[PDB]
Every structure is written in structure tokens, then in C-alpha cells.
């Protein structure tokens, strides 16, 4: 599925050598029980991402119809990514880009702080997610460091989804980073980083591809080599987590990257 900043976020995770520690699993079990209880109150969905083994534990409540998951996708309990992949597919493509930007800023910030301090922070936003009838509804999303390892590395990351009290439209996902103790709520302005997911050269190449030019025509019109065009094309496929150029075109348009 289309996505952004996957490489960059994995790089932040790679700054903590969590997978090298001998960790107690009973801690993860206690958190899994808490998250099931919480979903029984909010009627939503919880994901616990475990950096020690790169696995996700997903809990979906029967009342979480706003996710629009199929019977088979709801039956999941353990995903093999740091992301709950079929939940992400349900997010409006424009909102997914902003979510990714907030997560990257949030993890950059929290991973470079002390273990005790990083726990006082929370990243939040309000996303559009599509239900079973293809209608977008507004969902409150939380990202938060839940547990650290004894040696101070990030161990568990907590993600939460629930139907928001606010169903009114507004431009963007109103991303925020909150420091709970100091009572500080920082609003993120994501517009400029969004416009820069793709470089200007990558955007030109994609507009040519969409228009119907061949590598040879693109090289002719942008005064670059066919080798270079194909280097950019392949970079774009990686940046947008898609498999071919027609897929890249649809992703760029849906996510409003051009």
C-alpha cells in the first residue's frame, strides 16, 4: 500500500538497539491486557509496536465499525510490521501523509530524549478513516512511547484510534505534540514538509509520466539522461511505497504530493 517516510522512520528506530537486550515478556502481556480493557471502553482500536522484535499486536473492538475492516482483517491479533498495515490503508491518503510527518517528528524528538522524559510526551491528531460504506469519518489518533527497556531504549510504542467527538471538517489533521506534566500543547504546521515529500525534480518527472511521456521524452524535455530519469523513477517508487509508475501517479495525486 502507498505510504511515506517508511525509510526515515525505520532510521529513527534503528538509533536504539532494543533487539539486543534480554527483556521480560510479562511486561508486554500486562500492556496487552490494559489495551484490550481500554478498547472495551472506547469501542476502538489499539496497536502496540514492539521494537525488540519488530512485531505489532493489534486489538480491534467489535464496535470499531469506523475502521471498515473485513471479518478476516479484524480477526488479526499479531502483525509482523512495526505498523498495523491494513488499518493504515483505511486512512484518507492526504491525512496519511500528515500522520507520517507527525510520527517522524514525534519519534525524532522522543528517541533523542532521556527515557524518563520521553514518556511525558504524546502525539495526537484527527484523521479521516473510511468505513464499510466508503464514508470518511473523523477519528482521534494517539502515538505515545509506552515502555522503555532497562537500558533506556524505546521498547513499546502505543497507538490508539477511536471515533472523535469532533466530526467537523478542517484543513489538515491538527497534529500536536503535548508535554503532559508542563501542560504544553504544540501545534505542528506540516504544510511545508508535505510539499517537500517529493523533490521538485521528482514532481516534474511524475507530471511527465502522468502526461504520458516515455523515459526518452522526459530526458529530452528536462535535459537529463535516460539513466537519470530511471534513477528518479525508482526513487519515487521507494518514497511512496508503490510498485510501478502508474501506481506512483495515483499515489502522488491522492496524497496531494505534486
Grid coordinates belonging to 236 = 519515487
d(CA 128, CA 108): 25
Compute CA distances 28 → 37, 50, 80, 130, 160, whole Å: 14, 9, 16, 30, 16
Answer for which of 77, 81, 112, 167 binds a second copy (CB under 8 A) is 167
Contact positions vs Cl ion (CB under 5 A)? 65-66, 126, 131, 174, 183, 224-225, 228
As measured in angstroms, the least distance from the Cβ of 168 to Cl ion is 8
As measured in angstroms, the least distance from the Cβ of 54 to a second copy is 23
228 binds, among a second copy, Cl ion, none (CB under 5 to 8 A by kind): Cl ion
Of 179-187, 197-205, 211-219, 237-245, which part binds a second copy (CB under 8 A)? 179-187
User: In this chain, which residue has its C-beta nearest to Cl ion?
Assistant: 183
Contact 65, 106 (CB under 8 A): no
* Kind of pairing between the strands at 121-130 and 154-163: unpaired
DSSP 3-state of 149: coil
164 binds, among a second copy, Cl ion, none (CB under 5 to 8 A by kind): a second copy
225 binds, among a second copy, Cl ion, none (CB under 5 to 8 A by kind): Cl ion
Compute CA distances 160 → 10, 163, 220, whole Å: 20, 10, 49
Of 20-28, 108-116, 166-174, 240-248, which part binds a second copy (CB under 8 A)? 166-174
Angle at 232 between CA 230 and CA 233, to 5 degrees: 60
Residue 159, phi then psi, degrees to nearest 5: -125, 135
Please say which residue, 181 or 192, places its beta carbon nearer to a second copy: 181
Grid coordinates belonging to 235 = 526513487
Grid coordinates belonging to 85 = 498495515
178 is a contact residue toward a second copy (CB under 8 A): yes
Binding mask 48-77 for a second copy (x = CB under 8 A): --------------xx-xx-----------
200 is a contact residue toward a second copy (CB under 8 A): no
Nearest to 159 by CA among 173, 172, 146, 174: 146
137 is a contact residue toward a second copy (CB under 8 A): yes
As measured in angstroms, the least distance from the Cβ of 181 to a second copy is 4
DSSP 3-state of 185: strand
Under the rule (CB under 8 A), what is the footprint of a second copy? 34, 37-38, 41-44, 62-63, 65-66, 120, 122, 124-125, 131, 137, 144, 146, 158, 163-167, 174, 176, 178, 180-183, 185
Amino acid at each position: 500500500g502507498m505510504d511515506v517516510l517508511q525509510k526515515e522512520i525505520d532510521e529513527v528506530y534503528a538509533t536504539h538497539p532494543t533487539a539486543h537486550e534480554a527483556l521480560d515478556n510479562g511486561i508486554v502481556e500486562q500492556h496487552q491486557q490494559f489495551v484490550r480493557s481500554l478498547t472495551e471502553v472506547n469501542g476502538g482500536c489499539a496497536v502496540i509496536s514492539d521494537l525488540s522484535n519488530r512485531k505489532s499486536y493489534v486489538t480491534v473492538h467489535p464496535w470499531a465499525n469506523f475502521l471498515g475492516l473485513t471479518p478476516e482483517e479484524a480477526a488479526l491479533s499479531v502483525i509482523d510490521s512495526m505498523d498495523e498495515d491494513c488499518i493504515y490503508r483505511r486512512i484518507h491518503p492526504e491525512d496519511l501523509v500528515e500522520k507520517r510527518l507527525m510520527e517522524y517528528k514525534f519519534f525524532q524528538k522522543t528517541f533523542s530524549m532521556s527515557p524518563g522524559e520521553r514518556l511525558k510526551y504524546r502525539g495526537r491528531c484527527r484523521l479521516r478513516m473510511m468505513n464499510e460504506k466508503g464514508v470518511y469519518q473523523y477519528i482521534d489518533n494517539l502515538v505515545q512511547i509506552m515502555q522503555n527497556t532497562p537500558a533506556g531504549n524505546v521498547w513499546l510504542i502505543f497507538c490508539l484510534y477511536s471515533l472523535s467527538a469532533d466530526q467537523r471538517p478542517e484543513q489538515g489533521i491538527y497534529a500536536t505534540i503535548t508535554q503532559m506534566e508542563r501542560g504544553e500543547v504544540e501545534t505542528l504546521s506540516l504544510s511545508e514538509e508535505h510539499r517537500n515529500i517529493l523533490s521538485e525534480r521528482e514532481k516534474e518527472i511524475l507530471r511527465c509520466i502522468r502526461k504520458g511521456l516515455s523515459s526518452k521524452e522526459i530526458a529530452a524535455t528536462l535535459y537529463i539522461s535516460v539513466n537519470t530519469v530511471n534513477r528518479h523513477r525508482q526513487n519515487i517508487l521507494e518514497k511512496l511505497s508503490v510498485g510501478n509508475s502508474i501506481e506512483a501517479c495515483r499515489a502522488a495525486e491522492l496524497m496531494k504530493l505534486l
